[PDB]
Short mmCIF file of C-alpha atoms and ligand atoms in Angstrom, two decimals:
data_model
loop_
_atom_site.label_atom_id
_atom_site.label_comp_id
_atom_site.label_asym_id
_atom_site.label_seq_id
_atom_site.Cartn_x
_atom_site.Cartn_y
_atom_site.Cartn_z
CA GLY A 1 72.46 -19.28 -16.96
CA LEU A 2 73.86 -16.05 -18.34
CA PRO A 3 77.23 -15.88 -20.11
CA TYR A 4 77.78 -12.48 -18.43
CA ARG A 5 79.31 -11.90 -15.01
CA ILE A 6 78.05 -8.60 -13.59
CA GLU A 7 80.88 -7.07 -11.58
CA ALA A 8 79.88 -3.48 -10.74
CA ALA A 9 76.75 -1.41 -10.08
CA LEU A 10 77.21 1.91 -11.87
CA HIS A 11 73.83 3.67 -11.76
CA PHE A 12 70.09 3.17 -11.32
CA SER A 13 67.29 5.60 -12.19
CA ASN A 14 63.56 5.34 -13.02
CA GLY A 15 63.35 1.56 -13.08
CA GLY A 16 66.55 1.30 -15.11
CA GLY A 17 70.02 0.26 -13.99
CA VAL A 18 73.48 0.32 -15.59
CA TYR A 19 76.09 -2.31 -14.73
CA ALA A 20 79.62 -3.22 -15.77
CA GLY A 21 80.19 -6.85 -16.68
CA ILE A 22 82.26 -9.50 -18.46
CA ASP A 23 81.55 -11.82 -21.34
CA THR A 24 82.63 -15.08 -19.72
CA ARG A 25 83.14 -16.75 -23.12
CA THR A 26 85.71 -14.13 -24.21
CA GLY A 27 86.62 -12.04 -21.15
CA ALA A 28 85.46 -8.94 -23.04
CA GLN A 29 84.35 -5.94 -21.00
CA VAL A 30 80.69 -5.00 -21.51
CA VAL A 31 78.06 -2.65 -20.10
CA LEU A 32 74.63 -3.99 -19.12
CA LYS A 33 71.52 -1.82 -19.06
CA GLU A 34 68.31 -3.47 -17.86
CA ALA A 35 64.72 -2.32 -17.46
CA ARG A 36 61.55 -3.52 -15.80
CA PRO A 37 58.02 -2.63 -16.94
CA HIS A 38 55.78 -0.29 -14.97
CA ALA A 39 52.03 -0.45 -15.52
CA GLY A 40 51.01 3.11 -14.82
CA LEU A 41 49.48 6.35 -16.01
CA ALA A 42 50.03 8.32 -19.20
CA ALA A 43 51.30 11.22 -17.08
CA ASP A 44 54.03 8.85 -15.86
CA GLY A 45 55.62 8.85 -19.31
CA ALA A 46 57.45 6.01 -21.00
CA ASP A 47 58.64 3.35 -18.57
CA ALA A 48 62.18 1.97 -18.33
CA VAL A 49 61.50 -0.77 -20.89
CA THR A 50 60.06 1.61 -23.50
CA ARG A 51 63.05 3.93 -23.14
CA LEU A 52 65.45 0.96 -23.25
CA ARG A 53 64.07 -0.22 -26.59
CA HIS A 54 64.24 3.28 -28.09
CA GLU A 55 67.92 3.53 -27.13
CA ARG A 56 68.67 0.12 -28.64
CA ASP A 57 66.85 1.20 -31.81
CA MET A 58 68.87 4.42 -31.98
CA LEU A 59 72.16 2.60 -31.35
CA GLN A 60 71.23 0.19 -34.15
CA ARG A 61 70.63 3.12 -36.51
CA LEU A 62 74.11 4.44 -35.63
CA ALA A 63 75.95 1.10 -35.81
CA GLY A 64 79.42 1.16 -37.32
CA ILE A 65 80.07 4.78 -36.30
CA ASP A 66 83.29 5.28 -34.34
CA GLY A 67 82.19 6.94 -31.10
CA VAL A 68 78.83 5.15 -30.79
CA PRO A 69 78.81 2.03 -28.56
CA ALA A 70 77.84 -1.14 -30.39
CA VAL A 71 74.89 -3.31 -29.40
CA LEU A 72 76.37 -6.70 -28.58
CA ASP A 73 73.29 -8.50 -27.30
CA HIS A 74 69.70 -8.09 -26.13
CA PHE A 75 67.30 -10.46 -24.42
CA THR A 76 64.38 -10.73 -22.01
CA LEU A 77 63.88 -12.90 -18.93
CA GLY A 78 60.17 -12.72 -18.22
CA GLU A 79 59.52 -9.00 -18.68
CA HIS A 80 63.04 -8.05 -17.54
CA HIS A 81 64.80 -6.53 -20.55
CA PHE A 82 68.59 -6.66 -20.83
CA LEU A 83 70.70 -4.58 -23.23
CA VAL A 84 74.39 -5.45 -23.62
CA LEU A 85 76.60 -2.68 -25.00
CA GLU A 86 80.31 -2.33 -25.65
CA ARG A 87 82.19 -0.49 -22.91
CA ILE A 88 83.73 2.82 -23.95
CA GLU A 89 86.96 3.21 -22.02
CA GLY A 90 88.09 6.66 -20.91
CA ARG A 91 86.69 9.45 -18.76
CA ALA A 92 83.59 11.59 -19.11
CA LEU A 93 84.30 15.21 -20.01
CA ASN A 94 82.71 16.54 -16.81
CA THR A 95 85.41 14.90 -14.68
CA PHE A 96 88.03 17.10 -16.38
CA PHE A 97 86.44 20.22 -14.88
CA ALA A 98 87.51 19.11 -11.40
CA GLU A 99 91.31 19.45 -11.70
CA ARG A 100 92.13 20.42 -15.31
CA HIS A 101 90.28 23.75 -14.84
CA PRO A 102 91.86 25.44 -11.73
CA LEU A 103 94.41 27.27 -15.51
CA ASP A 104 95.01 29.06 -12.14
CA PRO A 105 94.75 32.91 -11.71
CA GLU A 106 98.25 33.44 -13.24
CA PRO A 107 99.47 30.19 -14.89
CA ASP A 108 102.20 29.04 -17.28
CA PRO A 109 101.21 29.87 -20.90
CA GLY A 110 102.82 26.58 -21.90
CA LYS A 111 99.94 24.82 -20.16
CA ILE A 112 97.47 27.43 -21.43
CA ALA A 113 98.34 26.85 -25.09
CA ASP A 114 98.37 23.09 -24.51
CA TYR A 115 94.88 23.26 -23.00
CA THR A 116 93.45 25.39 -25.82
CA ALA A 117 94.73 22.95 -28.43
CA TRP A 118 93.29 20.11 -26.32
CA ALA A 119 89.84 21.68 -25.94
CA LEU A 120 89.61 22.44 -29.67
CA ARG A 121 90.50 18.81 -30.41
CA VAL A 122 87.64 17.64 -28.20
CA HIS A 123 85.03 19.96 -29.71
CA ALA A 124 86.16 19.07 -33.23
CA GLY A 125 85.94 15.35 -32.47
CA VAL A 126 82.51 15.76 -30.89
CA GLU A 127 81.35 17.79 -33.90
CA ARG A 128 82.58 15.19 -36.40
CA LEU A 129 80.76 12.51 -34.39
CA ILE A 130 77.55 14.57 -34.28
CA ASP A 131 77.85 15.11 -38.04
CA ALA A 132 78.06 11.36 -38.67
CA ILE A 133 74.96 10.89 -36.50
CA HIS A 134 73.08 13.46 -38.58
CA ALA A 135 74.12 11.60 -41.74
CA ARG A 136 72.14 8.59 -40.50
CA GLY A 137 69.03 10.75 -40.04
CA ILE A 138 69.38 11.03 -36.24
CA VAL A 139 69.53 14.09 -33.99
CA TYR A 140 71.29 13.60 -30.69
CA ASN A 141 69.23 15.69 -28.27
CA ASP A 142 71.38 15.54 -25.13
CA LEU A 143 74.88 16.82 -25.98
CA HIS A 144 76.87 18.15 -23.02
CA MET A 145 79.85 17.36 -20.78
CA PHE A 146 78.22 14.41 -18.98
CA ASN A 147 77.53 12.52 -22.22
CA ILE A 148 80.97 12.98 -23.83
CA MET A 149 83.65 10.32 -23.32
CA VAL A 150 87.31 11.27 -23.75
CA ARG A 151 89.18 8.07 -24.58
CA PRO A 152 92.84 7.48 -23.64
CA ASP A 153 94.00 8.24 -27.20
CA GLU A 154 92.06 11.58 -26.97
CA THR A 155 89.30 10.49 -29.36
CA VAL A 156 85.73 11.18 -28.24
CA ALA A 157 82.53 9.18 -27.78
CA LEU A 158 78.95 9.64 -26.58
CA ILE A 159 77.41 7.47 -23.88
CA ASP A 160 73.62 7.74 -23.59
CA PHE A 161 71.41 7.65 -26.70
CA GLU A 162 68.01 7.34 -25.01
CA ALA A 163 67.22 10.97 -25.94
CA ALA A 164 68.14 10.72 -29.64
CA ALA A 165 65.32 10.89 -32.18
CA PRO A 166 64.92 10.60 -35.96
CA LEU A 167 65.79 13.85 -37.73
CA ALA A 168 62.61 13.76 -39.84
CA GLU A 169 60.49 14.24 -36.70
CA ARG A 170 59.62 17.89 -36.02
CA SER A 171 59.45 18.41 -32.25
CA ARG A 172 59.52 21.80 -30.54
CA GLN A 173 60.83 20.06 -27.41
CA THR A 174 64.28 21.42 -26.51
CA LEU A 175 66.38 19.75 -23.77
CA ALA A 176 68.44 22.23 -21.69
CA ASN A 177 72.23 22.29 -21.40
CA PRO A 178 73.96 22.41 -17.97
CA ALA A 179 75.28 25.93 -18.76
CA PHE A 180 72.59 27.87 -20.67
CA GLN A 181 68.77 28.07 -20.81
CA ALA A 182 67.08 25.83 -23.37
CA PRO A 183 66.76 27.76 -26.66
CA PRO A 184 63.17 28.66 -27.58
CA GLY A 185 61.77 26.97 -30.68
CA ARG A 186 64.39 24.74 -32.27
CA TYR A 187 64.31 21.34 -33.95
CA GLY A 188 66.23 19.19 -36.38
CA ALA A 189 70.00 19.46 -36.45
CA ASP A 190 69.72 22.99 -35.03
CA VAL A 191 69.27 21.56 -31.52
CA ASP A 192 72.73 19.97 -31.71
CA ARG A 193 74.12 23.06 -33.43
CA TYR A 194 73.09 24.94 -30.28
CA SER A 195 74.56 22.45 -27.81
CA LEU A 196 77.85 22.46 -29.74
CA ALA A 197 78.06 26.26 -29.47
CA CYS A 198 77.44 26.01 -25.72
CA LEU A 199 80.21 23.40 -25.54
CA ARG A 200 82.60 25.78 -27.33
CA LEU A 201 82.38 28.22 -24.42
CA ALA A 202 81.95 25.69 -21.60
CA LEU A 203 85.32 24.10 -22.44
CA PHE A 204 86.99 27.37 -21.39
CA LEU A 205 84.83 28.70 -18.60
CA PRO A 206 85.36 27.83 -14.93
CA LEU A 207 82.62 25.77 -13.31
CA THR A 208 81.22 28.52 -11.07
CA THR A 209 80.91 31.07 -13.88
CA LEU A 210 79.46 28.33 -16.09
CA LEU A 211 76.39 27.84 -13.90
CA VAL A 212 75.99 31.51 -12.94
CA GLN A 213 76.25 33.40 -16.25
CA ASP A 214 73.22 33.22 -18.55
CA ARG A 215 73.12 33.21 -22.35
CA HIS A 216 72.72 36.99 -22.75
CA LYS A 217 76.31 37.22 -21.48
CA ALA A 218 77.63 34.96 -24.26
CA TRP A 219 79.23 37.84 -26.16
CA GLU A 220 80.97 39.01 -22.98
CA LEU A 221 81.99 35.41 -22.27
CA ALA A 222 83.52 34.96 -25.74
CA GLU A 223 85.55 38.17 -25.47
CA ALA A 224 86.65 37.26 -21.94
CA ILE A 225 87.85 33.83 -23.07
CA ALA A 226 89.68 35.37 -26.03
CA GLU A 227 91.81 37.53 -23.75
CA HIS A 228 92.84 34.56 -21.58
CA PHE A 229 93.15 31.79 -24.20
CA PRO A 230 94.84 31.81 -27.66
CA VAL A 231 91.64 30.80 -29.45
CA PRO A 232 91.11 31.90 -33.05
CA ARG A 233 88.75 34.70 -32.21
CA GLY A 234 85.90 34.17 -34.70
CA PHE A 235 85.55 30.64 -33.30
CA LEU A 236 84.27 32.05 -30.01
CA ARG A 237 82.40 34.81 -31.87
CA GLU A 238 80.45 32.21 -33.85
CA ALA A 239 79.51 30.31 -30.69
CA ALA A 240 78.01 33.45 -29.14
CA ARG A 241 76.34 34.21 -32.47
CA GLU A 242 74.64 30.80 -32.37
CA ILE A 243 73.65 30.96 -28.67
CA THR A 244 72.05 34.43 -29.13
CA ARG A 245 70.29 33.94 -32.54
CA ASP A 246 66.94 34.87 -30.89
CA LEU B 1 78.20 33.97 -5.41
CA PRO B 2 79.21 32.66 -1.93
CA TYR B 3 80.08 29.24 -3.36
CA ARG B 4 82.89 27.79 -5.48
CA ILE B 5 81.90 24.84 -7.65
CA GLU B 6 84.70 22.27 -7.63
CA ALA B 7 83.26 19.27 -9.50
CA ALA B 8 80.39 18.39 -11.84
CA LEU B 9 78.75 15.28 -10.40
CA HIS B 10 75.65 14.54 -12.49
CA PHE B 11 73.09 15.99 -14.89
CA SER B 12 69.72 14.38 -15.58
CA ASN B 13 66.23 15.62 -16.48
CA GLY B 14 67.49 19.20 -16.79
CA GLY B 15 68.92 19.16 -13.26
CA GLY B 16 72.59 19.35 -12.33
CA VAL B 17 74.28 18.16 -9.14
CA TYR B 18 77.61 19.80 -8.33
CA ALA B 19 80.09 19.60 -5.48
CA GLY B 20 81.15 22.86 -3.91
CA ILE B 21 82.61 24.69 -0.93
CA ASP B 22 81.05 27.55 1.02
CA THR B 23 83.53 30.35 0.38
CA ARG B 24 82.82 31.86 3.81
CA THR B 25 83.03 28.99 6.30
CA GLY B 26 84.98 26.73 3.92
CA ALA B 27 82.51 23.88 4.37
CA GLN B 28 81.72 21.17 1.82
CA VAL B 29 78.30 21.52 0.17
CA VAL B 30 76.31 19.99 -2.69
CA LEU B 31 74.82 22.33 -5.32
CA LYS B 32 71.65 21.39 -7.20
CA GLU B 33 70.34 23.73 -9.89
CA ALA B 34 67.38 23.85 -12.26
CA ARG B 35 66.20 26.15 -15.03
CA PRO B 36 62.48 26.58 -15.83
CA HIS B 37 60.95 24.50 -18.64
CA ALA B 38 63.99 22.22 -18.42
CA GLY B 39 63.30 18.53 -18.02
CA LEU B 40 59.57 18.92 -18.70
CA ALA B 41 58.00 15.53 -18.03
CA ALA B 42 54.77 13.97 -19.25
CA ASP B 43 53.04 15.04 -16.00
CA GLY B 44 53.93 18.73 -16.43
CA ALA B 45 56.73 18.69 -13.85
CA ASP B 46 59.95 20.42 -14.88
CA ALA B 47 63.30 20.47 -13.06
CA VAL B 48 62.30 23.48 -10.95
CA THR B 49 59.14 21.62 -9.90
CA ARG B 50 61.14 18.55 -8.87
CA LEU B 51 63.73 20.71 -7.10
CA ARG B 52 61.01 22.57 -5.20
CA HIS B 53 59.52 19.21 -4.22
CA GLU B 54 62.86 17.82 -3.02
CA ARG B 55 63.44 20.88 -0.83
CA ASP B 56 59.95 20.49 0.66
CA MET B 57 60.60 16.87 1.65
CA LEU B 58 64.02 17.76 3.06
CA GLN B 59 62.47 20.56 5.11
CA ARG B 60 59.83 18.26 6.61
CA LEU B 61 62.65 15.88 7.62
CA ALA B 62 64.92 18.52 9.17
CA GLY B 63 66.85 17.36 12.22
CA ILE B 64 66.80 13.64 11.37
CA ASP B 65 70.26 12.07 11.47
CA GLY B 66 70.81 10.68 7.97
CA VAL B 67 68.76 13.26 6.02
CA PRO B 68 70.96 15.98 4.47
CA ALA B 69 70.20 19.45 5.78
CA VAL B 70 69.04 22.30 3.54
CA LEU B 71 71.83 24.84 3.82
CA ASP B 72 70.63 27.44 1.31
CA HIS B 73 68.36 28.05 -1.67
CA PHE B 74 68.13 31.06 -3.96
CA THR B 75 67.40 32.22 -7.50
CA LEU B 76 69.65 34.00 -10.02
CA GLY B 77 67.26 35.25 -12.66
CA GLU B 78 64.94 32.32 -13.25
CA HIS B 79 67.80 30.02 -12.18
CA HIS B 80 67.05 28.06 -8.99
CA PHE B 81 69.76 26.72 -6.68
CA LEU B 82 69.45 24.31 -3.75
CA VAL B 83 72.46 23.95 -1.43
CA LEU B 84 72.59 20.74 0.61
CA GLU B 85 75.04 19.36 3.13
CA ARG B 86 77.59 16.91 1.73
CA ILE B 87 77.17 13.42 3.15
CA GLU B 88 80.60 11.92 3.78
CA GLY B 89 81.19 8.24 3.06
CA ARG B 90 80.57 5.76 0.24
CA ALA B 91 77.39 4.78 -1.57
CA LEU B 92 76.32 1.23 -0.73
CA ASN B 93 76.46 0.12 -4.37
CA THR B 94 80.22 0.74 -4.58
CA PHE B 95 80.76 -2.02 -2.00
CA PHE B 96 78.89 -4.59 -4.14
CA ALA B 97 81.85 -4.60 -6.55
CA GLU B 98 84.66 -4.32 -3.98
CA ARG B 99 83.70 -5.87 -0.63
CA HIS B 100 81.57 -8.90 -1.42
CA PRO B 101 82.88 -10.56 -4.62
CA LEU B 102 86.02 -12.02 -3.03
CA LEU B 103 83.73 -13.76 -0.51
CA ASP B 104 82.91 -16.46 -3.07
CA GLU B 105 86.08 -20.97 -1.10
CA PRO B 106 86.15 -17.97 1.22
CA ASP B 107 87.75 -16.91 4.50
CA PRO B 108 85.21 -17.49 7.31
CA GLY B 109 86.48 -14.57 9.41
CA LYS B 110 85.93 -12.15 6.53
CA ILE B 111 82.54 -13.74 5.82
CA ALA B 112 81.62 -13.05 9.46
CA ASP B 113 82.97 -9.48 9.47
CA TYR B 114 80.96 -8.70 6.34
CA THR B 115 77.82 -10.31 7.78
CA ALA B 116 77.94 -8.27 10.99
CA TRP B 117 78.66 -5.22 8.82
CA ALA B 118 75.69 -5.81 6.50
CA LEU B 119 73.28 -6.39 9.39
CA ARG B 120 74.48 -3.17 11.04
CA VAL B 121 74.06 -1.18 7.81
CA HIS B 122 70.61 -2.64 7.16
CA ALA B 123 69.53 -2.02 10.76
CA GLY B 124 70.65 1.60 10.47
CA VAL B 125 68.70 1.90 7.21
CA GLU B 126 65.68 0.53 9.09
CA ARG B 127 65.90 3.16 11.84
CA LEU B 128 66.36 5.99 9.33
CA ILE B 129 63.31 4.82 7.38
CA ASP B 130 61.33 4.55 10.63
CA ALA B 131 62.15 8.14 11.65
CA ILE B 132 61.16 9.27 8.15
CA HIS B 133 57.78 7.50 8.35
CA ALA B 134 57.21 9.07 11.78
CA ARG B 135 57.52 12.46 10.08
CA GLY B 136 54.70 11.32 7.79
CA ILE B 137 56.56 10.85 4.49
CA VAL B 138 57.34 7.66 2.61
CA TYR B 139 60.66 7.23 0.89
CA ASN B 140 60.11 5.50 -2.44
CA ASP B 141 63.60 4.94 -3.92
CA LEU B 142 65.23 2.88 -1.16
CA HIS B 143 68.02 0.80 -2.71
CA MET B 144 71.80 0.47 -2.72
CA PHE B 145 72.35 3.56 -4.90
CA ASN B 146 70.58 5.89 -2.44
CA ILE B 147 72.28 4.70 0.78
CA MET B 148 75.48 6.37 1.98
CA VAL B 149 77.68 4.52 4.47
CA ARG B 150 79.35 7.24 6.52
CA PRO B 151 82.86 6.85 8.02
CA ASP B 152 81.49 5.75 11.42
CA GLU B 153 79.38 3.05 9.63
CA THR B 154 76.15 4.97 10.26
CA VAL B 155 73.92 5.37 7.22
CA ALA B 156 72.23 8.21 5.37
CA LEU B 157 69.91 8.60 2.40
CA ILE B 158 70.84 10.82 -0.51
CA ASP B 159 67.99 11.56 -2.97
CA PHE B 160 64.57 12.61 -1.70
CA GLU B 161 63.00 13.65 -5.01
CA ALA B 162 60.95 10.43 -5.04
CA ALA B 163 59.74 10.95 -1.46
CA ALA B 164 56.08 11.78 -0.87
CA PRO B 165 53.57 12.11 1.99
CA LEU B 166 52.06 8.87 3.26
CA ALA B 167 48.64 10.18 2.19
CA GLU B 168 49.10 9.65 -1.55
CA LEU B 169 58.37 2.00 -7.90
CA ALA B 170 60.69 -0.74 -9.26
CA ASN B 171 63.71 -1.93 -7.24
CA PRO B 172 67.15 -2.67 -8.79
CA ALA B 173 66.83 -6.34 -7.70
CA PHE B 174 63.10 -7.12 -7.96
CA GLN B 175 59.85 -5.84 -9.47
CA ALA B 176 57.64 -3.76 -7.23
CA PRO B 177 54.55 -5.71 -6.12
CA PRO B 178 51.09 -4.65 -7.32
CA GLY B 179 49.10 -2.26 -5.18
CA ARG B 180 51.27 -1.61 -2.14
CA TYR B 181 50.77 1.74 -0.43
CA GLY B 182 51.84 3.81 2.55
CA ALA B 183 54.86 2.73 4.57
CA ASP B 184 54.42 -0.76 3.10
CA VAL B 185 56.21 0.41 -0.05
CA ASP B 186 59.33 1.09 2.01
CA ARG B 187 59.19 -2.22 3.77
CA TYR B 188 59.17 -4.14 0.52
CA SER B 189 62.31 -2.25 -0.50
CA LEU B 190 63.88 -3.06 2.87
CA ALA B 191 63.04 -6.73 2.32
CA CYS B 192 64.72 -6.70 -1.10
CA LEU B 193 67.72 -5.00 0.52
CA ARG B 194 68.06 -7.89 2.98
CA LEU B 195 68.75 -10.43 0.23
CA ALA B 196 70.60 -7.92 -1.96
CA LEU B 197 73.33 -7.40 0.64
CA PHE B 198 74.16 -11.11 0.40
CA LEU B 199 73.59 -12.05 -3.22
CA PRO B 200 76.10 -11.82 -6.08
CA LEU B 201 75.24 -9.13 -8.60
CA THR B 202 74.31 -11.48 -11.45
CA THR B 203 71.98 -13.57 -9.29
CA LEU B 204 70.40 -10.33 -8.05
CA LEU B 205 69.48 -9.11 -11.52
CA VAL B 206 68.60 -12.47 -13.05
CA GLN B 207 66.50 -14.10 -10.32
CA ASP B 208 62.93 -12.85 -9.91
CA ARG B 209 60.92 -12.64 -6.69
CA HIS B 210 59.21 -16.02 -7.12
CA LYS B 211 62.61 -17.46 -6.10
CA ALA B 212 62.90 -15.45 -2.86
CA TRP B 213 62.73 -18.49 -0.57
CA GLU B 214 65.33 -20.22 -2.73
CA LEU B 215 67.73 -17.27 -2.56
CA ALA B 216 67.20 -17.11 1.21
CA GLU B 217 68.20 -20.78 1.35
CA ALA B 218 71.28 -20.06 -0.75
CA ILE B 219 72.30 -17.12 1.45
CA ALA B 220 72.23 -19.12 4.69
CA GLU B 221 74.56 -21.65 3.02
CA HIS B 222 77.34 -19.06 2.54
CA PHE B 223 76.70 -16.49 5.31
CA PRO B 224 75.94 -16.71 9.06
CA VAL B 225 72.77 -14.65 8.61
CA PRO B 226 70.05 -15.47 11.18
CA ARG B 227 67.32 -17.41 9.42
CA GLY B 228 64.41 -15.32 10.72
CA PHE B 229 66.09 -12.34 9.07
CA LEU B 230 66.04 -14.11 5.69
CA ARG B 231 62.54 -15.56 6.11
CA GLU B 232 60.99 -12.21 7.01
CA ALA B 233 62.52 -10.92 3.77
CA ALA B 234 61.26 -13.82 1.64
CA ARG B 235 57.80 -13.62 3.19
CA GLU B 236 57.53 -9.84 2.72
CA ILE B 237 58.68 -10.12 -0.91
CA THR B 238 56.14 -12.86 -1.77
CA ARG B 239 53.27 -11.69 0.46
CA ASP B 240 50.93 -11.34 -2.57
CA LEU B 241 51.75 -14.30 -4.82
CA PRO B 242 50.26 -17.77 -5.53
N1 LIG C 301 78.28 2.21 -22.96
C1 LIG C 301 79.06 2.74 -21.86
N2 LIG C 301 80.39 2.64 -21.86
C2 LIG C 301 81.10 3.13 -20.84
N3 LIG C 301 80.54 3.73 -19.80
C3 LIG C 301 79.19 3.86 -19.74
C4 LIG C 301 78.41 3.37 -20.76
N4 LIG C 301 77.11 3.65 -20.43
C5 LIG C 301 77.09 4.28 -19.26
N5 LIG C 301 78.33 4.43 -18.82
C6 LIG C 301 78.64 5.02 -17.65
O1 LIG C 301 77.46 5.82 -17.16
C7 LIG C 301 77.96 6.83 -16.53
C8 LIG C 301 77.45 8.13 -17.11
O2 LIG C 301 76.07 8.01 -17.33
C9 LIG C 301 79.59 6.76 -16.71
O3 LIG C 301 80.16 8.13 -16.86
C10 LIG C 301 79.78 6.10 -17.74
O4 LIG C 301 81.16 5.45 -17.66
N1 LIG C 302 74.32 15.55 -0.26
C1 LIG C 302 75.17 14.68 -1.06
N2 LIG C 302 76.27 14.15 -0.53
C2 LIG C 302 77.04 13.34 -1.26
N3 LIG C 302 76.76 13.02 -2.51
C3 LIG C 302 75.65 13.52 -3.10
C4 LIG C 302 74.82 14.37 -2.41
N4 LIG C 302 73.79 14.70 -3.25
C5 LIG C 302 73.99 14.10 -4.42
N5 LIG C 302 75.10 13.38 -4.35
C6 LIG C 302 75.59 12.65 -5.37
O1 LIG C 302 74.91 13.11 -6.64
C7 LIG C 302 74.66 12.05 -7.33
C8 LIG C 302 73.21 12.04 -7.77
O2 LIG C 302 72.52 13.02 -7.03
C9 LIG C 302 74.96 10.73 -6.39
O3 LIG C 302 73.76 9.86 -6.33
C10 LIG C 302 75.24 11.13 -5.24
O4 LIG C 302 76.45 10.36 -4.75
#
């Protein structure tokens, strides 16, 4: 009875799945997230349905922001919740680290300068987006390469908002970034300020060194990037300043 | 150190999965990493805890064809790494958008090729799950996203974080039934998989398990699936309903 044709199974995790579909009335591309309840223990945490409704709430707080997927529809069949979101076209930032990173040992500085400009675009777009989210009273809590969409026109977007929370809440909980240890004792907009600094270095470091080097090496990492990329040098300095503020 | 990360595959609950190559032997490997306190869940488990648990399950299942081997595991500071063998092939869920939508006024030869293919894949999933139970552990996340179809059409399973000993839930297509335990949890998932291989995606998500017999009827009208196959699935899925 649905007006949506589900055409692809993208992901499933913890009672929640993500599918690509089609509005049959308009042909419009959509994304479907759905959740099923789990009667369980408190130690089990929030179930898929509870986390689905929080994400919908957060996306409704952020409606109208360019870079935040719109909520098109929501319904329940029995206790099966469905959340219909607009589909952000483009590629996630983590898929650029496959090819666009091996900037080989000795490459053409034409491509080096082009990449530095490109990376600074992406961080600036992600920062503007994060700023607009803070203006609604929301702190994204999960900023990293796997959540950042790079659209065909080079503008950016963020995919998963299940981890976002109101800014007024004061929570010592810090989610870790793929590259550096979670910073001890941070809340409010400072959590995103930290992830953005991590992203400023990650955009230039090769994947292997990303996972291996810890946050005490940030100063070394900034100086190393400066010698190999034409970055305005205080830009990298300020990232290492933010990552090592404790 | 002895690995070169080539691609960033996924990051969830403070844990990253990366594709890599052993710099010595040149072999393809999968890198999983976790930092302490990261991904702290309501039950006190962090990403290191889950990674330690996944290695334990993989070690108890060593030697089973279809369970990725544990190649390496080490720490770099407080940073834990788990190096697994790369399963070649495609995840079963990527076929559900490519192989079986065109089989809507369809070509009967292709309908038959797909049917024999799906019964082979499901039978291989059955044997893998049987060998795993024999080793005393129950898979818990058996569904199309966890099954790899290798080049030779043999199957493997991919994520063993959810695995647990038989001593001590929801499926993409249907709700988990109340109070099933032991190896019976895995056989419910296998039953759901039987109908899932033959249903269109929208009917999978929309139809609940009260309609199992109806969906089994619908499947036999499009596919040459033996009826006992579909009825064992419908019966197992409804075994505790009015
Ligand atoms: N609202 C949305 N628009 C486009 N893609 C979405 C999406 N929500 C999830 N995805 C897809 O999930 C994967 C990353 O979690 C994929 O990287 C990502 O494509
Ligand atoms: N040993 C392995 N061989 C191939 N792919 C692996 C893998 N381990 C994990 N993946 C891929 O990572 C994602 C989530 O773990 C995907 O679920 C999964 O495709």
